[PDB]
Structure formats: structure tokens, C-alpha cells
Amino acid sequence: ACGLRSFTRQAAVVGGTDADEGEWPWQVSLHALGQGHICGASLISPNWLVSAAHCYIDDRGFRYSDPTQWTAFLGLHDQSQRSAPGVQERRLKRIISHPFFNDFTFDYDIALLELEKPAEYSSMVRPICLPDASHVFPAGKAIWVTGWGHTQYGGTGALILQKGEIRVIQQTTCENLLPQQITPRMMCVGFLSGGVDSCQGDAGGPLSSVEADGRIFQAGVVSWGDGCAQRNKPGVYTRLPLFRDWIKENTGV
Template sequence: MTPRSRVVGGVDAERGEFPWQVSLHMKDVGHACGASLINENWLVTAAHCVKDRFDGRPSMPSTWEAFLGLKTQKESSKEVQRRFLKQVIPHPNYNYDTYDNDIALMELERPVIYSDFIKPICLPAPQHIFEVGKQVYITGWGALREGAATILQKAEVRIINQTVCNTLMGGEITNQMLCAGVLQGGVDACQGDSGGPLSSKEGKRMFLAGVVSWGEGCARKNRPGIYTRVTKFLGWIKEKTGV
């Protein structure tokens, strides 16, 4: 069971194609996780990105910087906005061993300014069902086989039946998790992309179906990627953010 860190089997994303994609940089490390912009003040990411396994405390907001509007890492174009963080809120029931409830919120120190390259992703309704077989998108920088991708990568995967996924993954899939991938292998979100979005297109809008969480190996046959199921956490998100 490993956190995810790269998009494998993907292609370069166009600038502004996934304008809610955030790159979270850890001080003195650089790009460490992804996140999704849900309004001008708040990001959604994975709890395992921000909570220390050994002392159980969330990382200090000062540990992180959020970059929005990026296409390539290390660029400094006028489209890019950098923000410091005001607070980091991992889900109180996050489980380090099973990755259950692997979701966290981050409040920006000041709001972002929306543009063609920086826009929020929609949150789904609580009753929204992402149908089995539906095509969804994974995005991130992470690492392509070896080393980090400099250009934002995107890949298409499909929602996988929960029961099938639970069988494939040895009974480790909870109701708070969502499975997506290509069962023959070759496409996946693996470690750097942790916390990033699983995006689903519905009409002309894109919805946040999942948060990149964990998997076994990378792009292996019959080993789908596992995502935090966002519809299970809408009440908690609203309570903390008002979104």
C-alpha cells in the first residue's frame, strides 16, 4: 500500500485545461503533493500529505506554498499565483494504516484571483453517482517512471466496480474510497500526485469525484488506483469551509 506520486501513461495537459489543479510545495523540498481549488480560499488534498504518521499532528501551514496556474514546474509566468497557507485541516478520522478518510482541507492566506488558468472545480451533490465505466481524468506532475514531470500530465481512466475492486485489492476498500484505473495496466496516478484531483466531466462542468490516495505498485495489471470518495465528505467540507 503506497501513497501515489506520478501519472503514468499520460500526456501533456494544455495550459488552463485543469485550472483547479494546485501544486503543493513543501519548504526546501519543492513539489510534494497535488490539491484541488474548490473556491477562492480553499483547497482539497489528501490527509496523508499533511499529517505526520509518527506524532499524529498536521503539518504547520508555514511548511507549504500553493502554486496555481502552473503548467510546468519552476515556471514564473504572469498566469501563476503563489499563496501561503492560513490553516491545514486533516480529516479527524483519517487512518494511517488503511488510508480511510484520506482527505484534508487547506485555507489560503489570501484569496486567489480567478482567470482563464485558475478556476475552482465543482463539488458533486451528495447523491451523485459516478457510474462504473465512466471516463474520468487524473492529473499531476509527480514522476514519470524516474524523475518528476516538468509539464502537468493528464491521463484517462475509468471508474471501477467497488466489489470487483475490493476483491482485487484484498478487501481493503472502504465505502469512503473510489476505484479508478485501466485494469490491463499501463495508466495510473502513482506517488507527487497524492492529493490531486480525480476529475469527472458532466456536460460542460467538471466535478471532483475523488482525491488521489493510494495503490499497489504503479500502473500494474488488476491494481487500480484508489481515491477518496468526495461525496462522503461534503458535510465535513461545508462545515469547515462553507463551500
């Protein structure tokens, strides 16, 4: 029962960037309290979220690694409507960053978050499917990027959740075009639709990919907020399939 939306009503049925209510029920808004929306994540069970490890590194005097300073908003659609019927608010109980995560190269940039109380599944709150470690997202496959991200010049993000597409491209392309290190845990992508870039994610937000079955699987996790794709350069995102056993061993999922 993972990844099957409810697509309440219709509203947008011919395109657009604004997401519809209930169209991404696994998208989570993470607030470091006193600052509002800071990161994204994805629901995989009543108790566990997937996010990015670099969201939880202490900067300034604020301890982003401290779980007690975080609140997860699930089923949230408009960041000025935190109060709204489907919204669920949960405190964080534990953060499990990946043991091999490197704060400089953002390699192995994935984290597991435990809710203090279970989420309640609804029309607006539903889990996404996790791919097996052998699940392949081939070059050219379209994947959805969603969030409340800033512009690359930052640049307030939109109040209404935004959606856009990217496509998988060859790993060699990002190797020969970007100066940063591209590791096997990262996927190379190009812009597909939107949007003038894929910067609507969110760091720790999910990459949603509609599979042949029709259930939506999470192909990856957003790393750098401005590692987003655009007309002249590709973007890099964190893969998820090679982490499946590690997620399940740590969560039961």
C-alpha cells in the same frame, strides 16, 4: 461559476499526455519548502483547497502537519516555470484533516487547506465543482487524473503537467484483487488512457469528471501515489461526494 475551463488556444487537440495551459485551472502544486513539489490539491473557492490528509503527517524531522511550511502554486504549468505570467503563489493558513482519517489504512484521506490570502480567478486559476452526496459516478464512467507524479519506481515526474484517464469499476473487483482494505470511502478504478499507469497524480490531487451538463466535477482525491491503475491490477482512490456537507460546514463551500 465552478468548473468551466478557458481552453486557451488549441495546441493539443488530438490527444497526448501533456496538459495544455489553462486546461486544468483547479490543479494546485503544493511545495513543502526546501523540497519543491510534494503534493497536489484542488481549488474549490478563492480561499479553500481540497487535498489528502496523509500529505500532512510529520515524517523525519520535517513537520508536514505544520501549515507554515507549505506554499501553494496555482495556475502552474511547468514546474521549472514557477515564474511565468499566470502563476499565483499563496501561503497556507490552516490545515483541516478529516477527524476520522486513519494513518494506517488511509481511510477518510481528505483534508481542507485555507489560503493565507485569496486566490485571484483568471484564465489559469478557476475552481472545480463539488458533487452532492447523492451524485453518482457509475461503473465505466471515465475520469481524468492529472499531476506531476513519479513513476511507480520513482522515477522523476515530468516538468509539464500530465493528464490521463481512468474508469470506474465495481467495488468488488478491488476487494477480491487487492490485499489492502477497501472501505466505502474509496472508489475502485481501472486504467483507461495515458500512459502506462495512472501514477501521474499526485497525492491529494483531483479526479476530474466531465458531467452531462459539461461543467467538470471533482469525483475524488488521489490517495496513495502508487495506488495507481495499470494493466494487471486496479487502483483505489478516495471518494468525494460523501464529504460534501462536511466540506461546506467547514468552509462555507
